[PDB]
Amino acid sequence: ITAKPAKTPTSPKEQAIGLSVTFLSFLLPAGWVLYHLDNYKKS
Amino acid sequence: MFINRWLFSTNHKDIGTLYLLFGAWAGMVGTALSLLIRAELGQPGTLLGDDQIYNVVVTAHAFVMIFFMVMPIMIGGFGNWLVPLMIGAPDMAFPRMNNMSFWLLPPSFLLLLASSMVEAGAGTGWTVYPPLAGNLAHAGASVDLTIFSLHLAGVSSILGAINFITTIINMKPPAMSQYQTPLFVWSVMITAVLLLLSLPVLAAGITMLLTDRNLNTTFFDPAGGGDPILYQHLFWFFGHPEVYILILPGFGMISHIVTYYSGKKEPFGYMGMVWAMMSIGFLGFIVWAHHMFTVGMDVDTRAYFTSATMIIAIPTGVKVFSWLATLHGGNIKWSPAMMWALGFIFLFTVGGLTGIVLANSSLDIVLHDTYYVVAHFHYVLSMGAVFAIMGGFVHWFPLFSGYTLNDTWAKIHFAIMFVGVNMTFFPQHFLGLSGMPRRYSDYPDAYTMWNTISSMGSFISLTAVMLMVFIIWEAFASKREVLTVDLTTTNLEWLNGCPPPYHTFEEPTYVNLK
Amino acid sequence: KIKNYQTAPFDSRFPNQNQTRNCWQNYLDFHRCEKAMTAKGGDVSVCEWYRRVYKSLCPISWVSTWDDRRAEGTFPGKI
Amino acid sequence: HYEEGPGKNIPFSVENKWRLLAMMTLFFGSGFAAPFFIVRHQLLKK
Amino acid sequence: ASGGGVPTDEEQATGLEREVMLAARKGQDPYNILAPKATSGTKEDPNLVPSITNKRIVGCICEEDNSTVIWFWLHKGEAQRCPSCGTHYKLVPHQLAH
Amino acid sequence: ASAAKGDHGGTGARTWRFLTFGLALPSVALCTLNSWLHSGHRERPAFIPYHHLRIRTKPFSWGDGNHTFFHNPRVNPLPTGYEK
Amino acid sequence: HQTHAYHMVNPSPWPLTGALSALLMTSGLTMWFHFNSMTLLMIGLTTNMLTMYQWWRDVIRESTFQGHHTPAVQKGLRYGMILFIISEVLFFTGFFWAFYHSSLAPTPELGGCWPPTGIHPLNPLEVPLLNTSVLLASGVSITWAHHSLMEGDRKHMLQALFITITLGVYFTLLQASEYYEAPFTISDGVYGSTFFVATGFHGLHVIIGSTFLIVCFFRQLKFHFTSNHHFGFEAAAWYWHFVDVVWLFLYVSIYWWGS
Amino acid sequence: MAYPMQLGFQDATSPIMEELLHFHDHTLMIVFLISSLVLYIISLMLTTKLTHTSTMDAQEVETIWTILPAIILILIALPSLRILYMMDEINNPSLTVKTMGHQWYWSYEYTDYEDLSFDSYMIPTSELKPGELRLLEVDNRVVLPMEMTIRMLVSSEDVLHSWAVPSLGLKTDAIPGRLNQTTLMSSRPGLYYGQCSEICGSNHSFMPIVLELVPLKYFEKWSASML
Amino acid sequence: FENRVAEKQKLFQEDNGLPVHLKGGATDNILYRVTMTLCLGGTLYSLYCLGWASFPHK
C-alpha cells in the first residue's frame, strides 16, 4: 500500500505523550478501585 | 446534520461504522471483566470476598464478549461495510430496518449492565441453567434483565440475518452467479442462515424461563412435572450453532487475507471452501448434546453425538489445507494482517484438535466442566475470532478511514498479544487434565503454579489492548492518506478509493452474460 | 421364599443411566401389592421384594414426601 | 449532501489530535473502568 | 359474478416503477435490471458499456464458470481491454432515460 | 387423496367463491350446530389439593396475586379450594 | 441520478424510536413483574404502536405514492417475508418440543401418566373442532379474495376479505370463551404451561394476522392495490396460512393426541 | 488428588480410568502428529522465494486430504466407543449408595438394610489439623468397601450440582427429580478427592467429595457406628 | 369510496426537499415531535428507575 506523508506528523515527543496518556487512562481508575478493595469489603 | 447522519442512518457504511465503535467499546468492558477473573485466581485464596460477585463477573464476561463485541464487529461492522462493496450493491436491501438492528444493541447492553447493578447480579454462568437461574436461587430482577437483554440482541441479529440473506441473493449483478461471489460474502450468507434458525429457539427457551420466574409455569421445575434438562436441550440447540456463527465470518476474512498477501488472484479450491462452509453449517445443527455428556442420557445417544461431532473435522480440514495451498508459491508479503492470519491458522488448529478430544463422551466425563474446556474455547474462539478480527481490522482500516496505520507498531502489537494469549491459556490445559473445575473462585493449593502463570499472561495481553488504542490514535493524529492499492482487479471493495464515497455504485457495474 | 438380599439387582426394564422410573415403579408395585393383600386378608410379605428395592434406590426425601401424600390423599399415581 | 473523504466519514472530529486523544481516552477509558465500578458498587451494598 | 374497480399498473403505477415498466415495453433497460449480452470483444467489435458519466466499473467473467470476476474502471475514449483475457470494452455513454 | 369433487381446468375466483359458500361456510355451520348442542356447563371437578397443580412460586403481578388471568370461580379453584 | 432499480431510503427516525420503545417495554415489564408498576409498560406500548404506524405509513407512501417499489424491490420484500415466516416456524418449534418432551415422558410427580392426574382435558370434538373449521374456512375465503383482486373484481375482493376478517374474529372470541371456561390454568403444572403458552402465542398471532388483513381492507377501500402489484395483501395471506397451519399442528398435538 | 506442577490426569484408581488414560495417550499421539504436520507445512510455504501465482488445479489433492482424516477419525472413534459402552454395561453391584446435592454440601444415604444417612461438609481453612488439604477435606467421608462394584445414584434437593471423582473416572450431574446412575469400582484402598463440577451458586468452589475405601469388615463396623 | 390515489402521488412527489416521514403536513411533524418526546421522556424515566433499584430500600 502507498500513502502520502503525514499531513500532521506525530513526532516521538508527541507519541510519548500520547502513549502515556493512553496507558494512564486504563491504569489509574482500575488501580484506584483495586488499591481500595479492602476499604470496600471491610464494611 | 449530525442527527440525520448518525442517529437516522440508511447508509450501510456509517451503520457499519456504528457497529465497529460499539464493538470496540464493549470489548473494553469485556476485557476488564476478564482481568477481574484472573485477579481473583492469580494467587490462592480470595480477593473479591464475595463469590456471587465473581460468578456475576464470569457471566457478564461471556455475554459481553460474545453478543456485544464479536457479533457486532464481524456481522454488523465488517458485514455492513464490505458485503455491498464486494457484490457492487448500492446499499443493503432494507436500509432502514438495518439501522434498528444497530440501535437495539445499546439498550440490549444497558439491560445487561443493569442486571449486575440491581440485587446481587446474575451469577448463573452464560448458560443460565435453571434452577440456579430460577426464582428461588436467583430471586429478583437480575436474571429477568439478563433475559430481556438477550431478547433484544436476538431480535437485532434476526432482522440483520434477513437483510444479509436478501441482499446477497437478490442484489448481485444480474450476470453474476452465486458461485462468482467472494468467500467473505458466502461466509456472511451462511452465518445469517444459522442465526435465522437458531436464535428463535433460544428465544422460545428463555421465554419459558421467564414464565417460570414470573407466571408460575413449570416447564423446567420438577414440582410441576417439568425437567431442567429440557432447557439444556433448547439452549444448546442454539448454542452450538452460535459457536460456528462466531467463527464463520473469521474463516472468510482469513481467506481474503491469506489470498491478498500471497499475491494470488483467488484462493485455492474456491468450490471446496464453499462446500466446507456449507457442510460445517449443516453438521453444526445435529451435534448439540456433546454439551450434555454428563446429564445421564442414553449410551446409544451419547454414541451418536460423539460420532456425528467428529465428522465436522473433515470439512474443517479442507479449509485449513486450502489456506496452506493458497500460500504455496506466493509472493508473500509480511504485513501485520498476514501475521494475524498465520496466527489464526495454527492457533485455531490447536483449539480444534482439543475439540476432537472432547467429542469423545468417554473422555468428556473427566474433562467436562474443567479448565480443559476453558482452554479449548479460548484457543478456538479468542485466538480465532479475535485474531481474525485483528487481521481484518488492520487489512481494511485504510479502506474505512482513508488513513494508514504504522506497520511497525502494528507488528509490535501482534508480538505482545501472541505471547500473552498463549501464556494465559496454554497452562489451563494442565489445570484441566489435573482436575481443576471451572467457575471456581479459589482452587486447592496444588493448582497454584499454573493459575499464577495464567494470570500473569492476562496482564501481557492488557498491554497489547492498551497499545492498540494508541495505535489507532496515532493513525488519526498523523493523517497519512492512502494513494495506491494493489490487487484491485480481484478485490472490488478497494476500487472506489479510500474512503469510498457516501453513495457507491449509484450506477451499477457492467458484467456480461457471454 | 428367596432372599439373602445384598442390593437391588440389574433390571432390563430400566437399563439406562436414568433410574428415576425404577425407584417409582417399585414404589407403586409395593403399595399396590400391599393394598391388594390387606383387603384379601393375605400375606403382606409377598410384597416384601418391592419394598426392599424401592428403599435401596429411592431417596429418603422422595419416599418421605410420597408417604405423606398417601396420608394426605394427594398422591398422583394409581394405587 | 454529507461531507466526503478522509476524516469526514466518522461521527467524531479528527481535526485536532489532542482533542481526539482526550475523547479516545474518555471513550475506551470509561468502558474499561465500568466493571471495576460495578464490582465496587456491589461490594458497598453488602 | 363479474365487475371491475381495481386499477391496472398502466393506469396507476408511478415514479421509478413506471419508468421501469414503460422502458421494458420498448425493449430497453435503462435501470440495469437485465444481464447485458456480450459481443465478440475484438477491437472492431467491442463490448459497448453504456454510462451516465465518463466512467463505469466493468467486471469480466473471462471464461464462463470462473469463480473470480476481474474488476476495472472503463473510461471514456479508446476501447480498453480486460487485464486478464484482453476482451475489448468501449464506453458508449449517455442519456439512457426517455 | 383428491377429496371427491372434480374441476382443475379453470381456477377462477368464481370457483373459490363457489367453495367459500358451497363447502367452507356450511362446514362452519354444521360444526357450530354441533357445538351449540353439546354445550352446557359441565359437572365441575372435585377439589383434591394436589401439589403438582395450582403452583405458586411467585404471586401474580396483578390482583391479590393468587388469581390467574382468566380465573373463573365456577371451575378454577385457588390452592386452598373453591371460592364462594 | 441513480441507474439501478433499488430504493435508497430517506433518513428515518423510526428505527431509533423502535429501539427505544423496545427498551421501555422490556424495562417496563421488569418494573411490572417485580416493583409492581405499569407506567413504563404503558408508555413503551404507546411509543411502539406509534413507531409501527409511522414506519408502515412511510412504506405505503414510498410504494403506492412515490413509486419506488420496482420489480427488483418487490423480489426483495418476498424473500424478506418468507425468511421472517421461517424464523417464526422455528420459534413455535421450541414450544412443540417442550410439549412433546413433557407429554411423551410424564414424570412421577404428575402420576407418570398423560394427561396428569388432576387435569380434565377439553374435548377436541366440541369447540376446538369448530375453531378448526373456522380457520380452514378463512383459508378458502382469503384465496377467493386473492383471485378476485387478480381479476380486478373490487366488490368481491372486499367481500371475501370481510368474510375472512370475521372468521378470524369469531376464532378469537371462541378461544377467549374457552380460555375463560377452562377448568385448568397456566399454573396447573406443565400441562397448563404447555397449553396456555403455545395456544397463547398462537392466539396473539391470529390477532396480528387479523390486524394485518384489516389494514389490507382499508387500503383496498382506498384503491391502493392494482391487479398485479399488491404485496401487502400477499404477505398478509401467507401470514394467515402460517397461522392456519400452526393451529392444525396445535390441534393435532395438544388437543387430540394429548387428551 | 492433584499434586503440584502436574501436567496430565490423576493416577488411575478404577479400571475404567486406566482404560481412558491409554485412550487419551492414543488420541494425543494423533493430535501431536497433526499439529506437527500443519506447523512443518506452514514454515515450508513461507521459506522460499520461488513462486507460482497462476491458477492451480485443485481436486487430485483434495481426495488425499478428505479420505485420510476420515480414516484417522475411525481410528479414534472405535476405541472411544468401546470404552463408552463398557462404562455403561450390566454391572451386578454388591451395594447401592445415594448422594444428594444441596447448597452447599453433599448428603449420603446407605439404605439397602438400615436407614443410614449423613451430611458431608467442607472443613474450614481455619479448622484444618496440620497436614490436611485446603478446600478438599470433608468432615464426614464417604466410606466404601474396596474391590467391590458399587451402584452410585446421584440427585439434588435444590439446584444442579455434579458429583465427580477424577481419580476414579466419574462425573454425574445431580438433577432434582432425577435419579442418575453410575458405577464405582476402586482397585485399592485410600483417600480419593473430587469437587462439585457444576455451578450451584456462591459456594460452588467449597463443597467437595472424599471417598475412603477400606475393606468390607471395616466398612460394616463403620456403617453401624453411624446410625 | 372513490380513488384519490393520484392526488396523493402528486403531493408526495412534490420536490420540496422534505423526508418522506414529514411530507404529509403539520400532522406528520406533530405526531413525530410527540413520538420522539415520549421516547426520550420514558428513557430518562427508565434510567432513573434503574438508579432507584440499584441500591436497596429499608
Ligand SMILES: CCCCCCCCCCCCCCCCCC(=O)OCC(COC(=O)CCCCCCCCCCCCCCCCC)OC(=O)CCCCCCCCCCCCCCCCC
Ligand atoms: C507456558 C508454560 C509451559 C510449561 C511446560 C513445562 C513442562 C515441565 C515438565 C517436566 C517434564 C516431566 C515429565 C513427566 C511426564 C508426565 C506428564 C503426563 O502424564 O502426560 C500429559 C502431558 C503430555 O504432554 C506433554 O508432555 C507436555 C506438552 C508440552 C508441549 C510443548 C509446548 C511448550 C511451549 C509453551 C510456552 C508458551 C508459549 C508458546 C505456546 C505454543 C502453543 C503450543 O500433557 C498434555 O497432555 C498437554 C495437552 C496439550 C494439548 C495441546 C496440543 C498442542 C500442540 C502444540 C505442539 C507445538 C510444537 C512445539 C513448538 C513450540 C514453539 C512454538
Ligand code: HEA
Ligand atoms: C469459535 C468457537 C468454537 C469453534 C469453532 C469450536 C469447534 C469445535 N468444538 Fe468447541 N466449544 C466452544 C467454542 C468453539 N468450538 C465453546 C464456547 C464451548 C463451551 C461452551 C461452554 O460450556 O461455555 C465449546 C465446547 C465443546 C465441547 C463440550 C465440552 C464440555 O462442555 O464438556 C465439545 C465436545 O465435543 C466441543 C467440540 C468441538 C469440535 C469437534 C469442534 C470442531 O469444529 C473443531 C474442528 C477443527 C479441527 C479438528 C482442526 C482443523 C482440522 C484438521 C487439521 C483436519 C485433520 C484433523 C483430525 C483428523 C482430527 N466443543
Ligand code: HEA
Ligand atoms: C469471544 C469470546 C471471549 C473472549 C474474547 C474471551 C477473552 C478472555 N477470556 Fe473468557 N470466556 C468466554 C468467552 C470469551 N473470553 C466464555 C463464553 C466463558 C465461559 C463463561 C462461563 O463459565 O459461564 C469464558 C470464561 C473465562 C474464564 C473462566 C472463568 C471461570 O471458569 O471461573 C477465564 C479465566 O481466565 C477467561 C479468561 C479470558 C481472558 C484472559 C481473555 C482475554 O484477556 C484474552 C485476550 C483478548 C482480548 C483482550 C480482546 C481484545 C480485542 C478487542 C478488545 C477487540 C478490539 C476491536 C476492534 C479494534 C474493532 N474466560
Ligand SMILES: CCCCC/C=C/C/C=C/C/C=C/C/C=C\CCCC(=O)O[C@H](COC(=O)CCCCCCCCCCCCCCCCC)COP(=O)(O)OCCN
Ligand atoms: C353465533 C354464531 C354465528 C356465526 C358467526 C360467524 C359468521 C361468519 C360468516 C358470515 C356469513 C356472511 C355472509 C355474507 C352475506 C351475504 C352475501 C350476499 C352477497 C352475494 O352476492 O352472495 C350471494 C350468495 O350468498 C350466499 O349464498 C350466502 C350463503 C351462506 C351459507 C351458510 C350456510 C347455510 C345453512 C344451510 C347449510 C347446512 C347443510 C349443508 C350440508 C351439505 C354439506 C356439503 C351470491 O349470489 P349471486 O346471484 O351469485 O350474486 C352475484 C352478484 N355479485
Ligand SMILES: CCCCC/C=C\C/C=C/C/C=C\C/C=C\CCCC(=O)O[C@H](COC(=O)CCCCCCCCCCCCCCCCC)COP(=O)(O)OCCN
Ligand atoms: C385470545 C387470547 C389472546 C391472548 C390475549 C391475552 C394476553 C396477551 C399475552 C400476550 C403474550 C403471549 C403469551 C405470553 C405468555 C403467556 C400468556 C398465555 C396466554 C393466556 O392468556 O393464558 C391465560 C393466562 O395468562 C396469563 O397468565 C396472563 C399473562 C399476561 C401477561 C403477558 C406475559 C408477558 C410475557 C411476554 C414475553 C415476551 C416474549 C416475546 C419475545 C419476542 C421475540 C424475541 C390462561 O388463563 P388462566 O386463568 O391461566 O387459565 C384459564 C382458566 N379459565
Ligand SMILES: CCCCC/C=C/C/C=C/CCCCCCCC(=O)O[C@H](COC(=O)CCCCCCCCCCCCCCC)COP(=O)(O)OCC[N+](C)(C)C
Ligand atoms: C492428514 C493428511 C493431510 C494430507 C496432506 C497432503 C499433501 C499432498 C501433497 C502432494 C504434493 C505432491 C504432488 C506431485 C504430483 C505432480 C503434480 C504437480 O504439482 O505438477 C504441476 C501440475 O499443475 C497443477 O495442477 C497445479 C500445481 C499445484 C498442485 C498442487 C497444489 C497443492 C500442493 C499442496 C500445497 C501444500 C499443502 C499440503 C497439504 C497439507 C505442474 O505445473 P503446471 O503444469 O501448472 O505448469 C507447467 C506447464 N507445463 C506443463 C505446460 C509446461
Ligand SMILES: CCCCCC/C=C/CCCCCCCCCC(=O)O[C@H](COC(=O)CCCCCCCCCCCCCCC)COP(=O)(O)OC[C@@H](O)CO
Ligand atoms: C388490537 C391491536 C393489537 C396489535 C398488536 C401488534 C400489532 C401488529 C401489527 C400487524 C401487522 C400490520 C402490518 C401492516 C404493514 C403495512 C405496510 C405495507 O403493506 O407495505 C407494502 C409493502 O409490504 C411490506 O413492506 C411488508 C410488511 C409486512 C410486515 C410483517 C408484519 C407482521 C409482523 C408483526 C410482528 C409479529 C411479532 C410476533 C412477536 C412474538 C406496500 O407495498 P404494496 O402493498 O406492494 O403496495 C404498493 C401499491 O400500492 C402500488 O401498486
Ligand SMILES: CCCCCC/C=C\CCCCCCCCCC(=O)O[C@H](COC(=O)CCCCCCCCCCCCCCC)COP(=O)(O)OC[C@@H](O)CO
Ligand atoms: C417484550 C418485547 C421484546 C422485544 C420485541 C420488540 C422489538 C422491536 C420493536 C418493534 C418495532 C417494530 C417497528 C416496525 C419494523 C418493521 C420493519 C419492516 O417493515 O421492514 C421491511 C423490510 O423487511 C421485511 O419486509 C420483512 C421483515 C418483517 C419483520 C417486521 C418487524 C418485526 C419485528 C419483531 C421481530 C420478531 C421476531 C420473531 C421471532 C422470535 C421494510 O424495510 P425498510 O428498510 O424499512 O424499507 C425499505 C424500503 O425499500 C421500503 O419502501
Ligand SMILES: CCCCCC/C=C\CCCCCCCCCC(=O)O[C@H](COC(=O)CCCCCCCCCCCCCCC)COP(=O)(O)OC[C@@H](O)CO
Ligand atoms: C424432522 C425429521 C428429521 C429426522 C430426525 C428425527 C428427529 C426427531 C423426530 C423424533 C421424535 C420422536 C421420537 C420418538 C421416540 C420416543 C421419544 C422419547 O420418549 O424420548 C424422550 C423425549 O423425546 C422427545 O420428546 C423429542 C422431541 C423432539 C425434539 C427433536 C429436535 C429437532 C427439532 C428441529 C426441527 C426443525 C424444524 C422442522 C419444521 C417442520 C427422552 O428420553 P426418555 O424416553 O424420556 O428416557 C426414558 C428413561 O429415562 C426412563 O427409564
Ligand SMILES: CCCCCCCCCCO[C@@H]1O[C@H](CO)[C@@H](O[C@H]2O[C@H](CO)[C@@H](O)[C@H](O)[C@H]2O)[C@H](O)[C@H]1O
Ligand atoms: C487490572 C488492571 C490494573 C492493574 C494495574 C494497575 C497499575 C496501578 C496503577 C496505579 O494507579 C494508582 O496507584 C496508587 C497506588 O500507588 C493509588 O494511590 C493510592 O496510594 C497512595 C499511597 O500509596 C496515595 O498517595 C493515594 O492517595 C492513594 O489513593 C491510586 O489510587 C491508583 O490510581
Ligand SMILES: C[C@H](CCC(=O)O)[C@H]1CC[C@H]2[C@@H]3[C@H](O)C[C@@H]4C[C@H](O)CC[C@]4(C)[C@H]3C[C@H](O)[C@]12C
Ligand atoms: C355461490 C355458489 C355459486 C354461484 C355462482 O357463481 O353461480 C352457489 C351455487 C349453489 C349454491 C348453494 C345451493 O343453492 C344450496 C344452498 C341454498 C341456500 O339458500 C344457501 C346455501 C346453499 C349451500 C347455496 C349457497 C350458494 O348460493 C351456492 C354455493
Ligand SMILES: C[C@H](CCC(=O)O)[C@H]1CC[C@H]2[C@@H]3[C@H](O)C[C@@H]4C[C@H](O)CC[C@]4(C)[C@H]3C[C@H](O)[C@]12C
Ligand atoms: C461437484 C462440486 C461442485 C463443483 C462445480 O460445480 O464446479 C465439488 C465442489 C467440492 C467437491 C467436494 C470437495 O472437493 C471435497 C471432497 C473431495 C473428494 O475428493 C471427493 C468428494 C468431495 C466431497 C468433493 C465432491 C465434489 O467434487 C465437490 C462437492
Ligand SMILES: C[C@H](CCC(=O)O)[C@H]1CC[C@H]2[C@@H]3[C@H](O)C[C@@H]4C[C@H](O)CC[C@]4(C)[C@H]3C[C@H](O)[C@]12C
Ligand atoms: C357500498 C360499498 C362500495 C365501496 C366502493 O365500491 O368503493 C360496498 C362495496 C363492498 C361492501 C362491503 C362488502 O360487501 C363486505 C361487507 C358486506 C356486508 O353486507 C356489509 C358490510 C361490508 C363491509 C360491505 C360494506 C360496503 O357496503 C361495501 C364497502
Ligand code: CUA
Ligand atoms: Cu454444588 Cu457446584
Ligand SMILES: [Cu+2]
Ligand atoms: Cu457444541
Ligand SMILES: [Mg+2]
Ligand atoms: Mg456441566
